[PDB]
Amino acid sequence: GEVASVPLTNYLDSQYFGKIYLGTPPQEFTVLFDTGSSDFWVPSIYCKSNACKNHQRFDPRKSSTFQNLGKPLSIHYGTGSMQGILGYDTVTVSNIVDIQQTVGLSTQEPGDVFTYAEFDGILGMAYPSLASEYSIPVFDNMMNRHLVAQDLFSVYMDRNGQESMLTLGAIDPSYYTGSLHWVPVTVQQYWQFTVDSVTISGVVVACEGGCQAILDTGTSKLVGPSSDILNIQQAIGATQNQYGEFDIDCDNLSYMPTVVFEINGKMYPLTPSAYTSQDQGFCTSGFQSENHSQKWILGDVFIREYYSVFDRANNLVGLAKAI
Amino acid sequence: GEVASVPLTNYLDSQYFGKIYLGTPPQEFTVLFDTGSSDFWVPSIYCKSNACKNHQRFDPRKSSTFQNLGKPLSIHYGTGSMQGILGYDTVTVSNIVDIQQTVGLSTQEPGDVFTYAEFDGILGMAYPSLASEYSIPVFDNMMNRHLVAQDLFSVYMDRNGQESMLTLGAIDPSYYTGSLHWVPVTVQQYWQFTVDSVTISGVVVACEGGCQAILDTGTSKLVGPSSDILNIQQAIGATQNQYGEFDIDCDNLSYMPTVVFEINGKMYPLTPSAYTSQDQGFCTSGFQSENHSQKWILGDVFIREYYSVFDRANNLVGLAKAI
Ligand SMILES: [Cl-]
Ligand SMILES: [Cl-]
Ligand SMILES: [Cl-]
Ligand SMILES: [Cl-]
Ligand SMILES: [Cl-]
Ligand SMILES: [Cl-]
Ligand SMILES: [Cl-]
Ligand SMILES: [Cl-]
Ligand SMILES: [Cl-]
Ligand SMILES: [Cl-]
Ligand SMILES: [Cl-]
Ligand SMILES: [Cl-]
Ligand SMILES: [Cl-]
Ligand SMILES: [Cl-]
Ligand SMILES: [Cl-]
């Protein structure tokens, strides 16, 4: 029954990541705390890929508490893949000591997807139904052993600065204004819920009649079905460039529409500033299309605007305007 | 992972009750399945009170699986009290076999409160925080040992007939029309939630600005704070008689107001037929005052109109219009 404050870092267009420790004595890693997945893995000495060469690698030879399970682990992240082997060791996340935790030790991380990522590994924070075979999600172990004060965690992403924070077991009202609104999880695998509509000036531009969405800290953009995202890219004045990216004129923010997500009867507006990312003298749309799905992904673009609480005890998502 | 269908019976103005079995071999009892409490008890051979004389008494001498814990149990029901001693035995509720279940064996049930009650004992179905010391709620044992298919139960009360039903582990859409609406539990002790307002023709007559309420199968009436209930007794044309009861003219139902509870943005109307009980050539108000509380109790008057699902996995109450 403890609380862990995990400061999150991000560089430019990178994901948000933070520190955990693994083994006895503790070995340090940066991980993507990822509400879009449920497995926990880090690079290991058994991985020779370029990506592993560029990241911290777990050395089980130096841990008195490591135990190999031998079971394969395979995951996808972006267009890349990781292959590894599951074992047990002790994970420490500030206050919290999570012994005998299943963890993948990578063996293969081919390609450049993981090489230039800022994090070493991924710590999934979604439901066990999303976990790979033989894998037990870290937060589930924490809950089942009553290691956390409450069975929830909170994520604050600093739109402007470096005060981002993941809190295990508590909610910090200092990171938001107004009150938290609670949204029922519809399908317990991702952190999934119903979006009622997406509007501009009261006109429905997407999600007509309702759609499913997930709240995903491990995705940067706001992802939706082709035809809906088209409506939005046109409305915000985004246009495709050679890289396939949708660019927005940074100096036009003042003239662009506010895109409002209605979730469980409450409004979650995204201003042009919010949905436009400025990674240079170039601004890009924070909206992105998917072709083989109608399920929305509310990634960091959304979370930066709305402090997010993930409540396993009640199967709710809490949203409040981020400070 | 099973389902139990427990038929519920009621006679005239009695509570609703159903059958469970206790001991090895099984001994039969009728119990009040009571979402307003969390303890489980039945009369025993060690109780000589009149009330025990008029009810089935558990004989541990005949059960090979009984174990006395010796710990006292004390409960209140209506204006009466039960004193007993906790032990373990096996409870059977149709499909479901719940071994080593804490159960109070009564020793003292003085006064007439329990004597003329139809049930032998009480099986509380609220949260563990409401349970007496050393007592483990039956449904919590069922959930913790994965004895039920889903961690919820559903209650249908037949306003007109004898088709009432308690279902452990499932929801039966045949008992309701339209769809279930889910209401968040605010305080996990009783099945408690927020009522937004109580209105007649759109005018707020009670619960101005919101109030707390519980959904309680072990209470007959709809209970609220003095001043609010006054507004309602006056509006429905109820008047006090010598017995302190509020009587309603049965032939005036057609002229009386509909009293609407707004809960989580949805309307739950109670027609004059619904809130008027006809236990003879006399009709009485289903509303009742309480003086030392502002927390409403939505008892059988409400549940008869709205099929009720109690969901422990999600800490929700589900409501739908009863058939
Ligand atoms: Cl990254
Ligand atoms: Cl799950
Ligand atoms: Cl909790
Ligand atoms: Cl907290
Ligand atoms: Cl809601
Ligand atoms: Cl939908
Ligand atoms: Cl589409
Ligand atoms: Cl703006
Ligand atoms: Cl009774
Ligand atoms: Cl509790
Ligand atoms: Cl369940
Ligand atoms: Cl069901
Ligand atoms: Cl209130
Ligand atoms: Cl009052
Ligand atoms: Cl009527």
Author numbering:
A (entry chain A), B (entry chain A): 1 to 323
Article excerpt on this structure:
Bovine and camel chymosin are aspartic peptidases that are used industrially in cheese production. They cleave the Phe105-Met106 bond of the milk protein κ-casein, releasing its predominantly negatively charged C-terminus, which leads to the separation of the milk into curds and whey. Despite having 85% sequence identity, camel chymosin shows a 70% higher milk-clotting activity than bovine chymosin towards bovine milk. The substrate-binding cleft and active site are located at the interface of the two domains.
